[PDB]
């Protein structure tokens, strides 16, 4: 096996294992020291300040099993720190009957178990697990374990009656899941729950939801509430928040509601970030963000979505969740967004961003699989001044459209994304700046200009604005990890409103994914404008990009590109002349980023493992 | 609940938990400290002299289930000391995807994994497991774990390919079981396979069993070969060693040999005790141990065997053991007898014996379920100067004769049990001892005599000499735990060669077992002898009572008398006239026996408890 990155590369499959570690890893954001990970989990801000993240873990494997969860800590999401114990970065592992066959998905109780942190998590035993298989009640239960040291280490309750598992009957029959306990405090829900508690009987302070469906008719959130503030044990069923048909959709702007929910959540948000209010916030707006299953024909059938909602009470004392409008959070390969509060009145969320390599041709050669994307703040993203003229503005798709008392202009309301602060003022402190001059693409514009400043490697960010005229049959954007043979292109075209990442030519290795992504933006014309523009900025990472539109729009994706010289950037142009011109203007470059782990050497594989003739034997794991 | 043992008992079932804790239990022997206990496993002699003992072990529950070793110690086989560690007096408990269902029985390696005592144990997966259910491949392995600490903890090796488990491809298809590795090393067998090792490769000094059956057509006794010296991953199948018919019997001295074998294990004795020849020493002989399932319609369905044997080596490398002839290791309500070997040629043989309250109605009130049996030295039994009129002699069936050059006398060998020397020497010791004068019983013999001497509670050990005229119809024996109105009688009735133990009087509690229990006893006459005797010693402890006769038969059952006086014993006889009459002479009575386990309070209950509505989801254990 050659490593050489100078000429085309040979047959990589007979590469030995973590000899490809290094070439196509990110080193700017949250990643495993090795191995398999998938889903964020555990995400709390812990009482110093510092914010703790887990996530699904499988150390010396690349394929899924013995499902853990790894951690790590960090006092600005930025910089990391490994926890490092009895079993290495692991913090929670299957050890009893009741999860022997993972611990998956949870959240965090900040004041549980005798005052402690306390993780609410899914707790799995054998038995057929998934959407489309036929799952019997049992095998997937939600179960405590708190902490005494701030997260290096968790201790379950006991199996049995009164202890763990702690909820396992299904609330309905027939399910397609019944996992990834979200718990959250709500004054706006425990409001309008306040007339109903006779009923149920159910009054604490935390509500959870549990994230499934029901076969042959469509997904499901299952709302729980704590029956008594200050225990933990007890928690009361009051019925579905969200239910959606067999594989619904509610247009173009909003991605499939597929067969089943995965890592759902419930947050309230107000422009400023995080929502604490009751509902008395006019400015406030109810959200559930959550993946679904089977809804799509590619990334690996998973649309990361949310909904803004509005609650009605049931005369059962339960919240049925209508949904207002309804968008994706991310429209790339990511999935199983996790949000949380964090101090300053902010919530935010992270998802975790999978290989494009789906054959597992070059895994055991990488010796890990996955990456988390950026951390990012929510809120509730308002545009004022919209013109009615806006193509499409009143089909209030994803966003909300709200008239002026004379007609003439209007309010957006969506949801907004964008990378933490901390993150930005980071990457940008570290990194050698290029601010760039601004650029008029008309009729001499080339199809790809190198910009006046380059990259030295793949860590980098990229901004700019573009400004088009409102009716604009041009295309621009950036093209990113370019040398004359290989390179991603990132286009925009207004016409179609499709934000493209063509991958055609972004490595000479076959095997990982070549297929163009897509998301669509709104450009909101504002009142009195001749032009309407997209920012647009991108991070580049190892082999993420991961690429913001107009703090609204989030695309992740994967490139490979085998040759070392394969890191340059510049702009793309598609029919641009005297008459159609695209401005460019606020460019620069951010080369280099930030080192996400100080602490771990460049290569921190331990070596694969092999579970051996068992794993097929037992069929929960594939074994490697 | 009244507790009040001079009037009839109420209705116990109203008891709490553990109410009746004391009532019933066991003082002079290896008990756990409560809950449910079964099969003695992992046993040794330690590098210090002491004595190690496992049990398969379910603390708090009076059902099996979450099978775990609980432990302890004896430097005498006699007073007890638990370990005590993290978990209590467990020591191997189920924690991995391998072993979660059950750390099901095992056997000691003395010079393991680097040096150290090592266990090789069944590791219990998921799937349906028993000899009546259809079982796959997996659900039973063989897994290994050492001890740096002489049994108070224990390592396991990890999981995967070329580590646990160490043992998981099924030797031949649709086995009824397979489970209980018995590691042994012998001389014997390595001289036997010495001409073979080219054909299989393995080398080691090391053997093991693996106990099983075949769907449909019988019980069968694996053999395996350590592959080589020093290395304990690799153990190669050599074939079959004992194979045995669909529900066989070789008669009535014999029991039957069932659908399948539990925890077999393989020796070599001689008259002295054990043998370590390699075939050289003409008075030693080869045998096997084996509990059978499904060959019997009372006692669990379960009979405690063994079987003298000639090996023959195949052509393949492997040995088949034949049976020369087959008997009962114990008759009564006992079983998972486990043999090791002891300093001084000692082969020392222990078992289970179980409650007789089937169908679990004052199991929770017990707030325990079992104990062992007593330590017994096996030794070839060998019997000199038998007449060859001896009825039914030639028949050879649980013994082997060999005729004197003349015809004129016959040696019988047999397997001999007897209670280890330790116990006996302690028990005689503590114990108030009264030696009883002999007594002639004859017309004048009342049907019950009690003794001149009387025990003052339920821990005692009676013995006598039973001399018999040849052709006598009287029956003679034992009355223990009599009151008027409760008694259990043991008789002797040398006409039809049957040792009963009458249970119809044994309480007034109406729901433990009251079935008479039967051993088939040969009394070998002696040349020139005009009589005929019976060596009978019992042991009484608490509902223990435990029978030996002649060093050859024995017999352990059940007797839970009601009232707080029915501790008395005596002489029974039945038919002795002035012609046919029974002496009995070296009567002892010896009052108190041992504190076998002197740390213990009297009440060592923890309370028992539920493992809730899972239990049922999960269907692996009862739950309680
Ligand atoms: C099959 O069998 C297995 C094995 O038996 C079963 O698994 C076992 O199940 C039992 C029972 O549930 C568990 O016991 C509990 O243990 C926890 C502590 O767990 C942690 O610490 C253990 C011991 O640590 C020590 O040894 C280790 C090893 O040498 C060493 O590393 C360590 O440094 C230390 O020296 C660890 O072994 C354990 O690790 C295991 O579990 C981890 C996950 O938790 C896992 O990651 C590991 O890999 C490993 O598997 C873990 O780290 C105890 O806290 C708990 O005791 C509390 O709860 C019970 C009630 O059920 C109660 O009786 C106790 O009194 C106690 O409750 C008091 O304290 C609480 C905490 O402070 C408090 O919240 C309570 O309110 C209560 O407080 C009382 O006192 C205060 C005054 O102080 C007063 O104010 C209050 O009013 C009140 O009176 C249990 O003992 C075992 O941990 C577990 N073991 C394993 C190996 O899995 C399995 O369940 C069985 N399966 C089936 C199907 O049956
Ligand atoms: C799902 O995930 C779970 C969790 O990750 C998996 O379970 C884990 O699996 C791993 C991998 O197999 C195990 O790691 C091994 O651990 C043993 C030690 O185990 C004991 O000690 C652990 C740590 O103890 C410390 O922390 C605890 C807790 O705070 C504390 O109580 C204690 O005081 C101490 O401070 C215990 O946690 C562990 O308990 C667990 O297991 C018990 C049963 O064993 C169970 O009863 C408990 O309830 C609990 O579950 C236990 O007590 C290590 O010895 C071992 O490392 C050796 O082996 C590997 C090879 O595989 C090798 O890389 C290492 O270098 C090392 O081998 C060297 O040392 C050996 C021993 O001396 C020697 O024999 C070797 O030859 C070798 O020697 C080398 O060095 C010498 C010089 O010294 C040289 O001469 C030689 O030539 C050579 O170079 C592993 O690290 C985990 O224990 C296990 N954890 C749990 C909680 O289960 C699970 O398998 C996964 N499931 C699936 C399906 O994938
Ligand atoms: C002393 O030691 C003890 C440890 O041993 C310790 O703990 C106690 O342990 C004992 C066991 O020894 C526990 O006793 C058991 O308790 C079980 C639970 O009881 C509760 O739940 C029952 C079942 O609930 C389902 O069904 C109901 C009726 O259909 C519904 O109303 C429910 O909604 C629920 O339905 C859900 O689940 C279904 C599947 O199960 C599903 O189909 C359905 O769709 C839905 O999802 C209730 O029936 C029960 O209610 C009765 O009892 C309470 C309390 O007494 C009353 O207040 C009620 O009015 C009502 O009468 C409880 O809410 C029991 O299920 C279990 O019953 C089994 O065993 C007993 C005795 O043998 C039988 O009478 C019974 O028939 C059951 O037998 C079972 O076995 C057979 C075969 O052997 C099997 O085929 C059959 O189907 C069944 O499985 C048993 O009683 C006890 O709970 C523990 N108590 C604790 C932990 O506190 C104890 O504490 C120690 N003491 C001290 C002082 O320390
Ligand atoms: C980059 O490397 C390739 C392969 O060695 C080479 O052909 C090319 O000249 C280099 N420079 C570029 C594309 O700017
Ligand atoms: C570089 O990054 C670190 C880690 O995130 C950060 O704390 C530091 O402030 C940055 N340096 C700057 C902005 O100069
Ligand atoms: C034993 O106790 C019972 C019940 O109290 C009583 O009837 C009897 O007289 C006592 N003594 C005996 C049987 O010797
Ligand atoms: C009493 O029993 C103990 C424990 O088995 C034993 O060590 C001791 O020798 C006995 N006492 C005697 C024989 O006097
Ligand atoms: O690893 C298991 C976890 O990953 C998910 O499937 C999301 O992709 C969750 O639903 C589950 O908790
Ligand atoms: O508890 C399980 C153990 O008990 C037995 O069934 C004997 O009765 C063994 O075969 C097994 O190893
Ligand atoms: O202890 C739960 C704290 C909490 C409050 C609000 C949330 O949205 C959440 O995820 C957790
Ligand atoms: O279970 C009572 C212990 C406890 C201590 C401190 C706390 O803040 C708490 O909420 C509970
Ligand atoms: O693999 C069959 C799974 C299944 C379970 C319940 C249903 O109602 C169904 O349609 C399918
Ligand atoms: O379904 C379990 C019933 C139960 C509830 C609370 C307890 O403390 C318990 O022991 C059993
Ligand atoms: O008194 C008004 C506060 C108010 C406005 C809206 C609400 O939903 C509410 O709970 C309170
Ligand atoms: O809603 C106030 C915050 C906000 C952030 C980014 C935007 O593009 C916007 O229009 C509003
Ligand atoms: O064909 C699109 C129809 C139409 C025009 C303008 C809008 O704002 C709208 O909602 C629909
Ligand atoms: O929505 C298309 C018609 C229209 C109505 C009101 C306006 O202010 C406008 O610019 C266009
Ligand atoms: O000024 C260049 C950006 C731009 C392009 C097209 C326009 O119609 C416009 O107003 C601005
Ligand atoms: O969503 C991209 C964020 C962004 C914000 C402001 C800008 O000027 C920009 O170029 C990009
Ligand atoms: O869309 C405007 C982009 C732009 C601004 C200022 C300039 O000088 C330019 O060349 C382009
Ligand atoms: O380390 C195994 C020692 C051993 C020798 C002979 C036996 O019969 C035995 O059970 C163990
Ligand atoms: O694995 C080599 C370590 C070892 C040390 C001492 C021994 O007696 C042994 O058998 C092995
Ligand atoms: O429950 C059916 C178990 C079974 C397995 C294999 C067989 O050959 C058989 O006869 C029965
Ligand atoms: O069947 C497992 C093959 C294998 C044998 C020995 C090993 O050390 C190993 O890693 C795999
Ligand atoms: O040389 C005789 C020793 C001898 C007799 C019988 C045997 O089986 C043996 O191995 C050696
Ligand atoms: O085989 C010598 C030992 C032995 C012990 C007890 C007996 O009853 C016997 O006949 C022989
Ligand atoms: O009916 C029993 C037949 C018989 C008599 C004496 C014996 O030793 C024998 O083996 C068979
Ligand atoms: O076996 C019954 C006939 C018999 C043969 C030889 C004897 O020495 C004897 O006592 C009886
Ligand atoms: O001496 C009383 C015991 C005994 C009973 C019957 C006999 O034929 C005998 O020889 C001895
Ligand atoms: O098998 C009962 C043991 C025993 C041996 C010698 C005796 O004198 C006796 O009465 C009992
Ligand atoms: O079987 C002989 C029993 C016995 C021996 C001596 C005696 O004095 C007696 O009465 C009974």
Redesign the interface.
Known sequence: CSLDQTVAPGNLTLCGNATLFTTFRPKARFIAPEGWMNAPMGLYQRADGSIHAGYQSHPKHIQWG?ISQGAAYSSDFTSWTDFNGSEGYKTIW??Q??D??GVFDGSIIKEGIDGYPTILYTST??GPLGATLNE???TE?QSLAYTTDDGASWIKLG?????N?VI??WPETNLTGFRDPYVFQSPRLEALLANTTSITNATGDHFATISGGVHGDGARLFLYRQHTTGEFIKWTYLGPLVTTGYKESYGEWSGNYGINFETAGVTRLNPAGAAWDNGSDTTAVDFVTFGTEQGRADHQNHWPLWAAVDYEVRDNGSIEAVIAYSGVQDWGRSYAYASFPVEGYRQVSVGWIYEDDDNVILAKQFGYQGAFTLFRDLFVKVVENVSPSTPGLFEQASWSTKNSTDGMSVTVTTLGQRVVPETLAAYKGNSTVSTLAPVMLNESAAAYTPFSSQPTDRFYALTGSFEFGLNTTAKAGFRVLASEEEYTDIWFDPASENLTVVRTASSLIKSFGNDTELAKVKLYEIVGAESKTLNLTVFVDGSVIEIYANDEVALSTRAYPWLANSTGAGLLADGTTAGDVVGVSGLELWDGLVDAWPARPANTSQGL??????AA??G?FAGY
């Open positions: 013995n299957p050890s009957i009741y022997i066959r035993s054998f019997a009640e049992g239960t199996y049995g009656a009164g202890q598992p396992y009957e493992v092999w579970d051996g003739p068992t034997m037992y929960l």
